[PDB]
Amino acid sequence: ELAFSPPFYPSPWADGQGEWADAHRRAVEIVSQMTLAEKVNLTTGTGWEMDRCVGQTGSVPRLGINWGLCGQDSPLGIRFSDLNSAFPAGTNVAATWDKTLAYLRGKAMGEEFNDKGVDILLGPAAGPLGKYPDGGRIWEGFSPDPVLTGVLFAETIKGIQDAGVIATAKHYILNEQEHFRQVGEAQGYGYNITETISSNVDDKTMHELYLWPFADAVRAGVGAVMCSYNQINNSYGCQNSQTLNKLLKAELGFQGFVMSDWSAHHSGVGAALAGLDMSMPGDISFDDGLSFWGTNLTVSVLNGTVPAWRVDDMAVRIMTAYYKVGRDRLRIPPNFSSWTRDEYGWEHSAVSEGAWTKVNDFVNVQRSHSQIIREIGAASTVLLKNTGALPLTGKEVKVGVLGEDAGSNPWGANGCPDRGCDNGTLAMAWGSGTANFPYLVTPEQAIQREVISNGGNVFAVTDNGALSQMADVASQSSVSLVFVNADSGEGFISVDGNEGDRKNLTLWKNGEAVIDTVVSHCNNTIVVIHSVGPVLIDRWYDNPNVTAIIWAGLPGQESGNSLVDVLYGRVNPSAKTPFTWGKTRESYGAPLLTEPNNGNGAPQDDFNEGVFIDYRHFDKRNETPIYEFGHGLSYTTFGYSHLRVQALNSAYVPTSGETKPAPTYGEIGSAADYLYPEGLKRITKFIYPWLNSTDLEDSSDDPNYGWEDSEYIPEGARDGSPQPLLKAGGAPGGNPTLYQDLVRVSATITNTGNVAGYEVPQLYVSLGGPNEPRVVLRKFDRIFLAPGEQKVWTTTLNRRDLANWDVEAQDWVITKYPKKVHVGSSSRKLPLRAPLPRVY
Amino acid sequence: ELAFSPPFYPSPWADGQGEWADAHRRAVEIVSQMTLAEKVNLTTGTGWEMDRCVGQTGSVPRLGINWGLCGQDSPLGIRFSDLNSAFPAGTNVAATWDKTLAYLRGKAMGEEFNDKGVDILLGPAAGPLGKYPDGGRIWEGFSPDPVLTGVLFAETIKGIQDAGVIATAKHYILNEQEHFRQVGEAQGYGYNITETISSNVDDKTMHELYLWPFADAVRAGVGAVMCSYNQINNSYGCQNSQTLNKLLKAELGFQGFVMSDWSAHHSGVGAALAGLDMSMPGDISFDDGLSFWGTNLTVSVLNGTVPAWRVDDMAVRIMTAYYKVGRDRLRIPPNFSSWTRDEYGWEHSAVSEGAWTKVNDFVNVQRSHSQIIREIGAASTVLLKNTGALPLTGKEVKVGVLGEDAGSNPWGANGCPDRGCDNGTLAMAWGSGTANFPYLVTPEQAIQREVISNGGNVFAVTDNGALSQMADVASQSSVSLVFVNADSGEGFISVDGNEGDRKNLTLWKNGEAVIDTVVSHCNNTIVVIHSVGPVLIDRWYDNPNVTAIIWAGLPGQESGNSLVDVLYGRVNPSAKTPFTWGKTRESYGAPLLTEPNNGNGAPQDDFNEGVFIDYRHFDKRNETPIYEFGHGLSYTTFGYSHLRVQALNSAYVPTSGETKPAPTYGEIGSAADYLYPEGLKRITKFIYPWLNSTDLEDSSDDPNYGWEDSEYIPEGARDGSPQPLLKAGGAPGGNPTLYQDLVRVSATITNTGNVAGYEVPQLYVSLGGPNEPRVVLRKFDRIFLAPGEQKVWTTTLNRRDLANWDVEAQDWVITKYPKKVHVGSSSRKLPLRAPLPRVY
Ligand SMILES: *[C@@H]1O[C@H](CO)[C@@H](O[C@@H]2O[C@H](CO)[C@@H](O[C@@H]3O[C@H](CO[C@H]4O[C@H](CO[C@H]5O[C@H](CO)[C@@H](O)[C@H](O)[C@@H]5O[C@H]5O[C@H](CO)[C@@H](O)[C@H](O)[C@@H]5O)[C@@H](O)[C@H](O[C@H]5O[C@H](CO)[C@@H](O)[C@H](O)[C@@H]5O[C@H]5O[C@H](CO)[C@@H](O)[C@H](O)[C@@H]5O)[C@@H]4O)[C@@H](O)[C@H](O[C@H]4O[C@H](CO)[C@@H](O)[C@H](O)[C@@H]4O[C@H]4O[C@H](CO)[C@@H](O)[C@H](O)[C@@H]4O[C@H]4O[C@H](CO)[C@@H](O)[C@H](O)[C@@H]4O)[C@@H]3O)[C@H](O)[C@H]2NC(C)=O)[C@H](O)[C@H]1NC(C)=O
Ligand SMILES: *[C@@H]1O[C@H](CO)[C@@H](O[C@@H]2O[C@H](CO)[C@@H](O[C@@H]3O[C@H](CO[C@H]4O[C@H](CO[C@H]5O[C@H](CO)[C@@H](O)[C@H](O)[C@@H]5O[C@H]5O[C@H](CO)[C@@H](O)[C@H](O)[C@@H]5O)[C@@H](O)[C@H](O[C@H]5O[C@H](CO)[C@@H](O)[C@H](O)[C@@H]5O)[C@@H]4O)[C@@H](O)[C@H](O[C@H]4O[C@H](CO)[C@@H](O)[C@H](O)[C@@H]4O[C@H]4O[C@H](CO)[C@@H](O)[C@H](O)[C@@H]4O)[C@@H]3O)[C@H](O)[C@H]2NC(C)=O)[C@H](O)[C@H]1NC(C)=O
Ligand SMILES: *[C@@H]1O[C@H](CO)[C@@H](O[C@@H]2O[C@H](CO)[C@@H](O[C@@H]3O[C@H](CO[C@H]4O[C@H](CO[C@H]5O[C@H](CO)[C@@H](O)[C@H](O)[C@@H]5O[C@H]5O[C@H](CO)[C@@H](O)[C@H](O)[C@@H]5O)[C@@H](O)[C@H](O[C@H]5O[C@H](CO)[C@@H](O)[C@H](O)[C@@H]5O)[C@@H]4O)[C@@H](O)[C@H](O[C@H]4O[C@H](CO)[C@@H](O)[C@H](O)[C@@H]4O[C@H]4O[C@H](CO)[C@@H](O)[C@H](O)[C@@H]4O)[C@@H]3O)[C@H](O)[C@H]2NC(C)=O)[C@H](O)[C@H]1NC(C)=O
Ligand SMILES: *[C@@H]1O[C@H](CO)[C@@H](O)[C@H](O)[C@H]1NC(C)=O
Ligand SMILES: *[C@@H]1O[C@H](CO)[C@@H](O)[C@H](O)[C@H]1NC(C)=O
């Protein structure tokens, strides 16, 4: 009955090909010098809260790796630190539709992480992709569209890695919701389950939707990939040989390392052989002093179960990432502590051991990164509706600012751990995807400053119970700006019954009544929404007193200043929604899985919609959104003309051949080489690589130690002989003939209005055939045009852009169905269209 | 037995002498043309909420007074309006010790009032003077010191009147507290009394303390005086022949008009003959449709009781004020409504009658008045303590801003009627002494802006219950700034049991615990107090972690900007405390009278301390204040040297002679002249001058109509013959030989530190003799000095400055006790001293 994940073995070994040759060579050179305990140190974290960073490996001080590799959250700024910046969330980056802004944000973040002593940034994210509009972590990623996500994910990775820090593509893969993601956490919420949720997805959907942005990340040169907490067809993400060995390593050709999510590692031998490379934070569960790896990995290799080539490959993949971004020349010891903001603390925080020492140096790493934050906030402010309220001119006599979302968090910008509250303006959602603010500029502050400077009077009512006081201010104002929000986050935090995932898609903090009060008293009401994702606005959006509506996402520390830049027209808004605004929750497709449906076994989440999420689903059901994917307004207008299409073919080459045999590097030795050194003071619960004695069974102490391999290990898992190459593989990101250009497309874009600004033209294709979506996004850019100016936008469609995943062939194939190309300003406003020429 | 107020009659008639000659002449010219109903219209308001302004008289359209004279609150900005400024409170002005700033604030206010169409500003105030540190309205005035108060009151009056608006010196006199000020209000608070509080004071104390600033106001040319709600020796303020006829009109030579406080008028004939000139808002009680004057005043003159010379004198005094400031050329109709902010409303708001019409024209009158407000706020920020925390340099790495008093009122700046709350930053206290803000710059906003511009990180915790959150921010900060407050107001509003008057002298909104939390976690804590008056700080002020303490008063709309100007040293603080900071409540003298002590008659408030209030009391009891009257710190130091004293080459001439007989102007006519015009639609409850019929008794309808004069009118009250001149009278402000200069005094002031700034030198005298305070303030200035610079400060002491009120002689006499002069930086730091030469 249950979804099954078939075996793919062995775990592919790194090949040092292409742009990875130099870093792999330097990795082989150092790993060839390492003993087994040194290798194991790289693969295994030293335990929860045992060092400075949220994750930290063992060290190799004999060879100059003098402190462990340090991994730190988050995808929008350094977590658990100080004197750092708080960037706009991923969903805002997607709303900019701007490759360059995604790159620069990545670079700015990389600089901060580097300057704090961090080796590995735990991000950015393209999983969750965005199947569920109420999924708790959708905002951390980019968009439910895989092409928008993959492009901006890849640019963000390149910025981070150009700054000298290893990026970690996460969460791989199908962790679309928070409910049932972890057994202990589910049990704490009162649910009786004994395994995590299983995401069950067909092979075509996997390739065409969820995997696609990870292909982009690999091709962009991402150093690490983080495996997820959920299962995929009932095999855990950190030991799923299909996703890790076959799709990521054999097909996408990934040459870096796979790192577990925190306590997502569920077996020693099983995970190592199924493609895991690094166990974080290193213990079985936080501070239990046990490890699936560490000592157990040393023993698994000494007893012959995990071949030497596999542990050698782990250490090579890790060191390859290290050398690829230059950690050997850039790394400095972490100069802050995740676990306290005090100057002094215990060296090993979890157990109060080691030296009482200076754990925070107070190093300011902000530089002028406030400028890119302000910029991105303004370029991610989506103007959804504008019947002439905007821009503001500075001649407004009285301005009202209404709603708690305009005001300060009265507990301070950092006053709730992991931002686990919805107090004041919503500039950052909750969980591990967070950073501490250096400050937070509110809409109230920025609007008040600006109104005053223009001679206006201005009043801010920020108590969402004070409805009569709001009504009076609204009645007296020339324009009323009303602020509302909706929040969500990671599932280890629940705010008002939202257990990560949101329990509805409507407004928080009495926002529905706030809107009603203001709109019924002011015929020039502008609604500004800060939110993690879509909100159901059908009830009020079309009221004629609502003269403009803005979605500004989660803008980070410069929130108010970004917003006023757009309100007053210093920046002409250009952002487009990176998701659909539907009429009802049901319009989006299936609800979250929030009740166990497989007894007390793993809840089963069948991805029955296949590729049809967000706009694809609305298009297939012929549903009319309130605001479609790709919609946003400008203070000017843009016209589209002169579509031209030209074939370039001049062929796909399915990859054929064999790998090398699995190499080994560095002598393994025997148990007598790997005892705990005499005179080493063992730190309580710290995870080490060493053995209590030369008796391997006693040093491991596994209760099932020593079975025949075939009782618990799949066939081929230990086979280091040459393996066949997969047809759809061949280079990082897949077969390189996928990236050959087949068609060139041009369209002329004209600023047909009176104000300079950026437009986001979009190019969609129809691949044809029964059950293909009517249109799917393939190209976009953000282009600046003065009034009356024209530019010719030219792009190319490659083989992969026009292909479908053919499950019978196990390859990408351009089908025989007739295709079309469409260019315009959104997924529904597509005035240019033409047939594509036949290419294969 | 009970305090008694002896008769002084007749009510002195205006004489047109000196600077008043031109305006009195025009008043006579116009009043000589008026009929009796026209005269009565000037004297009598038209009823509560019957027109645009808080008070409005009848009109005289036949002679070009085409709408009634408009009186509007408040002493710190226009009340019940829009598009106006909100100025620092009177207590802030006193803290500046700066004559020019006081003048400029009055001028800025006058400009706003004039441009809204208002004739008469209901302010400024010198009553309450400040006998009670917990008195509810002490912040509206200046200082408990009569000289600091009189000088700044006079400069405020001059500014207002130089802008073309009549100033109203209030409240005259001895309304030192709010408890029992009004019968109906006291009964609403559960007290059983049938008359208002009687303030009972000896003659010398009256002259040397409470009356002294009113002398200053009269000499400065104030057009109106407002009489008080309380009794003086058991005769109501608005019919007290001693205070109105004798002290104000006969002795101080006042040539303007006396106006009642609102519903403070308590009889027709009695009050007219005792010296009242204008009844506001014109009804007996609000909207009862009855008047002690109006119809009743017409009848009182027609029946022979109130002589024609008295009603003629009322009209002449009112018109003298109107001409003195130029209302004939400057007046425009009021262009706002006090009773609604909507554009449209009923012409007569109280009864919804007259036309439905445009009552608000939305005229902006702010100009650049924000500049003088910011300036006065900075110049009123008293630096009480500084052990090196200030000024801030911009190098602070992390800045904490703690306390609700830093943050916004979440109901909006104008979210509580008459500011009757203590939400967010305290920039204005409550009651009639208020204005609506155009905006309000909080300390949070301004500090955050400034820190961010310097590269600091900044966090604001504004929930006074969030103590652990404040502790964590305080622990992490380089400097913590903690904001606390204490509020009070007029007695028609009670907040948390403070029935106008404050129920204690300690902090509001959990401030004592906020200070404890911050100071116990940060060794560089700056405390900023916003308050109506003194707060008891003995418990925490001397904690060595409190590195500075500021009292910033009630700074109006620019609060946060005024403050950051001083914090960062753009302004070098120069303010001095205008009251004493004592150790205990008892240190100040007698408690408020808060329980009835005379059965259910008038509570009796005996002013037994005489001239010994505030610093005079501390000095007489040899108590050590925490911070003495006149204390404030600078970022530099000032030295005092080279005292020189010289008797002037240059006697007092007691006034002797007689007045003119009382004049009459305009023919009175008879009852048939003063019927309601045929076809005039009478507005419900509006107050008119006219008679229902020629039967005077029926038109009046007084239940005790028609007694013989001697049964209810004191002897002399109807005597229009020539009267003796009082010895201590002779010109506005009293005998002009009081103001002859007798001694010149010089002292050299040096800036002995390294920062430019203003110093406030102070000159005190000891008048000598057993009954006399050790020192009393006589002269002060604010003088700017560059580092190392010296200036010679020269001033003159006049006859009044060295005199005592001699009760036997009923005159000012320089006594034969030896006197001394003292110069220095506070009432206690007086390094220069010398005997004064004998002068008389
Ligand atoms: C014209 O026309 C006109 C118009 O119309 C008119 O007029 C009118 O007139 C009438 C008569 O006729 C009147 O009436 C009256 O009045 C009175 C007054 O009153 C007021 O005042 C008071 C006070 O007084 C005082 O002061 C003043 C000033 O300020 C003066 O003026 C006076 O004279 C006096 O003097 C005194 O003192 C002083 C000090 O203080 C000094 O300085 C001097 O020298 C002297 O000594 C007051 O009190 C009052 O008050 C009240 O009222 C009010 C209002 O409402 C209120 O608010 C308050 O609070 C109060 O109240 C209370 O009281 C009340 C009753 O009265 C009740 O109801 C309540 O509840 C409460 O409790 C006023 O302000 C009067 O007095 C009178 O009466 C009387 O009598 C009756 C009857 O019998 C009674 O009932 C009452 O009670 C009273 O009694 C008293 O007196 C008597 C005698 O006279 C006696 O016997 C008794 O015992 C008693 O005694 C006591 O007290 C007193 C005081 O009061 C004292 O002095 C003693 O010693 C004791 O202790 C009557 O009412 C009217 O007003 C008029 N009106 C108008 C509109 O103006 C005419 O008439 C015509 N003519 C022809 C020819 O036709
Ligand atoms: C989707 O998911 C969302 C996220 O999980 C979820 O969000 C939640 O939404 C609900 C609403 O749907 C929110 O709850 C509402 O919050 C309102 C605002 O609460 C705050 O303000 C209150 C009012 O304060 C005024 O009144 C006080 C009492 O007089 C004064 O003390 C105040 O000074 C203030 O004054 C103003 O009003 C005075 C007149 O009352 C006036 O004189 C004065 O001048 C001035 O104008 C506070 O009381 C409240 O604080 C109390 O309650 C909270 C908990 O709710 C405590 O933490 C506090 O300690 C304190 O006890 C807040 O500060 C509420 O007004 C609203 O109440 C109404 O509904 C509740 C039950 O639902 C009733 O008990 C109550 O009587 C109210 O009924 C009225 O309205 C309802 C419509 O809602 C109507 O049916 C009814 O007939 C009646 O008219 C309610 O609690 C909640 O905060 C959101 N949570 C989060 C985390 O965001 C959302 O629900 C989900 N969507 C759906 C559809 O499921
Ligand atoms: C002189 O004249 C002055 C002017 O009139 C006069 O002023 C008044 O002073 C008093 C005393 O200082 C003031 O009243 C105090 O106000 C404090 C703050 O109130 C606000 O915050 C409260 C706490 O909020 C936190 O806790 C809540 C409950 O857990 C949470 O829901 C919140 O989210 C918040 O969280 C923080 O703390 C949590 C731990 O608790 C923590 O988990 C979290 O992370 C975070 O850190 C709120 O409860 C309160 O709101 C409630 O109550 C008010 C009424 O007070 C209602 O209007 C609200 O609707 C709501 O129901 C406010 O928002 C209070 O902490 C303090 O409480 C203490 O005293 C009362 C009795 O007086 C006890 O019932 C209470 O248990 C507390 O006891 C503790 O402290 C006292 C010390 O006072 C101690 O003796 C005792 O042993 C114990 O330790 C108190 O109410 C008042 O506001 C002032 N009024 C004005 C107008 O300014 C002054 O008193 C006069 N002077 C004298 C000496 O007479
Ligand atoms: C709003 O209403 C007013 C009066 O009802 C009208 O004059 C104005 O044109 C309206 N403005 C908008 C935004 O339509
Ligand atoms: C406060 O404490 C710090 C401890 O780091 C100390 O270095 C500093 O000199 C102290 N400053 C004051 C204001 O005394």
Residue numbers in the entry:
A (entry chain A), B (entry chain B): 21 to 670, 674 to 863
Give excerpts from the publication.
Here, the three-dimensional structures of two industrially important family GH3 β-d-glucosidases from Aspergillus fumigatus and A. oryzae, solved by molecular replacement and refined at 1.95 Å resolution, are reported. Both enzymes, which share 78% sequence identity, display a three-domain structure with the catalytic domain at the interface, as originally shown for barley β-d-glucan exohydrolase, the first three-dimensional structure solved from glycoside hydrolase family GH3.
The subunit–subunit interface within the dimer of the AfβG and AaβG structures spans the α/β-sandwich domain and the extended loop between domains A and B. In AfβG there are an ethylene glycol (between Arg469 NH1 in both chains) and two imidazole molecules (between Arg387 O on one chain and Gly475 O on the other) forming hydrogen bonds between the subunits. AfβG has two molecules of ethylene glycol in the substrate-binding site, occupying subsites +1 and −1, in molecules A and B; the former is hydrogen-bonded to Arg99 NH1 and NH2 and the latter to Asp93 OD1 and OD2 and to Lys190 NZ, as well as to the first ethylene glycol molecule. In molecule A, several molecules of ethylene glycol occupy the substrate-binding cleft, one of which overlays on the MPD molecule at the +4 subsite when superposed on the AaβG structure. In the AfβG structure, for example, FnIII residues 762–764 are hydrogen-bonded to Arg45 and Glu49 of domain A in a symmetry-related molecule. There are 13 potential N-glycosylation sites in the amino-acid sequences of each of AfβG and AoβG, with nine and ten of them being occupied in their respective crystal structures; we have modelled 45 and 46 sugars in chains A and B, respectively, for AfβG, whilst AoβG has 40, 42, 41 and 34 sugars modelled in chains A, B, C and D, respectively. Furthermore, the A. fumigatus enzyme retains most of its activity at 65°C for at least 19 h, whereas both the A. oryzae and A. niger enzymes retain activity for less than 2 h at this temperature. Within the protomer, AfβG has two extra ion pairs, Lys151–Glu629 and Lys523–Asp516 (in addition, the former is relatively short at 2.6–2.9 Å), and the distance between residues 536 and 559 is shorter than that in AoβG (2.9 Å compared with 3.0–3.7 Å).
